[PDB]
């Protein structure tokens, strides 16, 4: 019968669009997740904390060593830890069916990821979590266990399966976790829109809204 907790849900279409992102430089490798959508990769801005890394993108449909990331057109969601990267024409695109929306206080979320195997990928899903908005920011708190490496993993509503955000932050001592929410009309405004792209974008933490957080970088 109907009960407190939601029943079985299919997260596989989300998992099919999750990518591994490696930004490699002399003496440092940034390893995060991303979300593919058409010719676009959606990632954290902090993937590009370090300039001029060689970017490798692993997907269910191939592995793409795009090399120097500074040549790529990018579109930041200004004020929050999300960036959209446009791939070259020779990068085979993802489908364009995922739904994105802002979270609400009705939502609970599961983290979704992917494992890469020889002939296939497999889907991974976490326990569901309550969420709490961090005032004057795009950050929402969640309680799902994460390791360094899991930034960029989608947080998915168990109400309607929409992607609400991607993992971003952890507290430096108490282990609290935070994801960054997608804005309203994200696909229409950032993906479908022909304008607003550039190659000369550089990461600046000061351009993200922090509210009462102090970022330790």
């Amino acid at each position: 019968s109907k009960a407190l907790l939601k029943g079985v849900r299919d997260f596989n279409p989300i998992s099919a669009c999750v990518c591994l992102l490696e930004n490699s430089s002399d003496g440092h490798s940034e390893r995060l997740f991303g979300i593919g959508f058409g010719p676009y990769i959606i990632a954290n801005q902090h993937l590009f904390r370090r300039n001029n890394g060689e970017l490798t993108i692993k997907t269910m449909h191939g592995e793409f060593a795009v090399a120097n990331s500074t040549q790529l057109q990018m579109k930041p969601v200004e004020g929050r830890d999300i960036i959209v990267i446009k791939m070259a024409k020779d990068f085979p695109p993802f489908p364009q069916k995922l739904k994105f929306r802002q979270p609400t206080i009705k939502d609970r979320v599961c983290m979704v990821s992917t494992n890469f195997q020889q002939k296939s990928v497999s889907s991974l899903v976490s326990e569901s979590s309550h969420i709490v908005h961090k005032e004057d920011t795009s950050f929402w708190q969640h309680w799902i266990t994460t390791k360094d490496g899991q930034a960029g993993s989608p947080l998915v509503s168990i109400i309607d399966g929409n992607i609400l955000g991607i993992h971003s932050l952890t507290h430096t001592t108490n282990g609290s976790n935070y994801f960054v929410e997608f804005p309203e009309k994200f696909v229409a405004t950032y993906l479908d829109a022909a304008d607003g792209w550039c190659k000369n974008w550089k990461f600046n933490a000061d351009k993200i809204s922090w509210g009462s957080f102090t970022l330790v970088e």
């Binding site: 995060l32 930034a151 971003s168 976790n177 009462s212 102090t214 970022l215 330790v216």
Partner: peptide, 7 residues
């Protein structure tokens, strides 16, 4: 308070 990118 004090936070870091999880990367």
């Amino acid at each position: 308070e004090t936070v870091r990118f999880q990367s």
